[PDB]
Structure 1
Amino acid sequence: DSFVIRGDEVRQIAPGQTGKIADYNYKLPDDFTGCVIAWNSNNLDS
């Protein structure tokens, strides 16, 4: 799964985690998830 999100929201992308962007748009299912890799690249953004 590929997407770019603000660094502040990176914690929300976790199994069973709750956040507005997380809950509404993309939330990991409350069970096994393989792995989550995040490297913030805000320089490329904006």
Structure 2
Amino acid sequence: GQTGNIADYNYKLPDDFTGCVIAWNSNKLDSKPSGNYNYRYRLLRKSKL
């Protein structure tokens, strides 16, 4: 039930989702001084997913 750019254009969980969301920081490993541009996200889609 969350509204936002990532929620509606990248990965939408269902309203009655049954599962565990586990998040932990990855700055120590996946951050580079020059700028890690490998990871991307979508910010323009025709409709909601």
CA RMSD across the alignment? 1.3
**How many residues end up aligned between the 2 structures?**
31
Percent identical pairs in the alignment equals 94
1:24–1:37: structure 2 CA closer, same or farther, 3 Å change rule? same
Give the one of 25, 28, 34 matched to 1:40.
25
Equivalent residue for 1:6?
none
1:20 aligns with 2:5: yes
Structure with bigger helix share is 1
Moved over 4 A (4+): none
The two structures have a TM-score, normalised by structure 2, of: 0.49
The two structures have a TM-score, normalised by structure 1, of: 0.51
Secondary structure of 1:43's partner? helix
Counterpart-to-counterpart distance in 2, 1:33 and 1:44 = 30
